[PDB]
Write a protein that binds this ligand. Structure first.
Ligand SMILES: Cc1cc2nc3c(=O)[nH]c(=O)nc-3n(C[C@H](O)[C@H](O)[C@H](O)COP(=O)(O)O)c2cc1C
Ligand SMILES: Cc1cc2nc3c(=O)[nH]c(=O)nc-3n(C[C@H](O)[C@H](O)[C@H](O)COP(=O)(O)O)c2cc1C
Lengths: 182, 181
């Protein structure tokens, strides 16, 4: 399939924060999630998990949870410029990690690295088929988990607005959940 | 190079390398790909030491052995150990933890290096090269060997070779170091 040259995709990929309301073809959504699934992971343990969120009301709640209060502003983000994107995008993908399914040594959380690898696949694949996304790291984790029925032992790592800009792997259905955690 | 989806699908962990030299141009494309990675607040905490010296690469290989007592998840032995010695190039990927998010007790520098090294690995595969993420190594001795300060964290080793409108990035000469830190 002809998407985009790898070097070109890597160079031209941008954080997209403004989305049209044009629907994402499930065929493209599948190519994006397949790319994430194809990611290398610590010992092929594949600790990444994804919740695909499409409901308007639920997306609006997620957007609210990604607000930055100046008092609690994390490093480098005085505001969260991707906040409205989480509301506007037809699809929001919530990327999580099972920490016990990746390396834990030298005080380092390799699940964070594994999810980074998988989400860079996800973002490059999306850009390659004409979609846009942005890694969102700022959000209230406990409220988000509560909203999506994500168990507290699962760690949420990033949110990915997805839409049109304005050695065997586990089955897709084992690492991607529709609407809420299963 | 190669179609993005195809490269993502066909990329493999390569652990056996030929002795064909890596063309300077390809090495640069691979490092530039890592430089182009997105990162927490564009702070770009990733750093890279490019090692080519035969003896230093042997030492790195010597350092990526698994001690039974410290055997991490799924790696009773390190299958990529010989690769570190064989490969024409080893890229040592590091992170500056203070230059990425640290909240909810999560080390986002690990995520940022993960992102940059997936660019590196995809780019490498796209131009006909092979690589493998090596997470198993003795960080202290490796840091000493390569003059890497202990406040800098080493995240991954990358044998590299042949198989047998966004915000400004930091310049390449500030994140890529030749031979040693
Ligand atoms: C964070 C990370 C660390 C890794 N460390 C090692 C390692 O120390 N030794 C090794 O042989 N492979 C290592 N790998 C490679 C995995 O074993 C490999 O990616 C996985 O089994 C999937 O196979 P594939 O890359 O060919 O698709 C590592 C991979 C990741 C993502
Ligand atoms: C780990 C991580 C967390 C991020 N969190 C946010 C975020 O919360 N809000 C936002 O607008 N962008 C976020 N970004 C996007 C970066 O700000 C962006 O990648 C960087 O500024 C470079 O821009 P570019 O992606 O267009 O090259 C995040 C990126 C990374 C890698």
């Amino acid at each position: 399939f002809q998407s985009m040259d790898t070097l070109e995709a890597i160079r031209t990929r941008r954080s997209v924060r403004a989305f049209s309301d044009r629907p994402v073809e499930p065929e493209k959504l599948q190519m994006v999630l397949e790319a994430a699934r194809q990611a290398p992971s610590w010992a092929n343990m594949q600790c990444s998990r994804f919740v695909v969120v499409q409901d308007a009301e639920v997306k609006a709640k997620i957007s609210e949870l990604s607000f930055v209060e100046a008092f609690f502003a994390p490093l480098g983000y005085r505001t969260n410029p991707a906040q409205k994107a989480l509301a506007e995008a037809p699809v929001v993908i919530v990327a999580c990690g099972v920490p016990g399914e990746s390396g834990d040594l030298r005080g380092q959380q390799y699940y964070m690295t594994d999810v980074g690898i998988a989400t860079e696949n996800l973002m490059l694949a999306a850009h390659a088929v004409g979609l846009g996304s942005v890694f969102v790291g700022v959000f209230g984790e406990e409220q988000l988990g509560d909203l999506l029925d994500i168990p507290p032992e699962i760690r949420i790592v990033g949110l990915f607005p997805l839409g049109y800009p304005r050695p065997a792997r586990k089955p897709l259905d084992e690492i991607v959940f529709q609407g809420k955690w299963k």
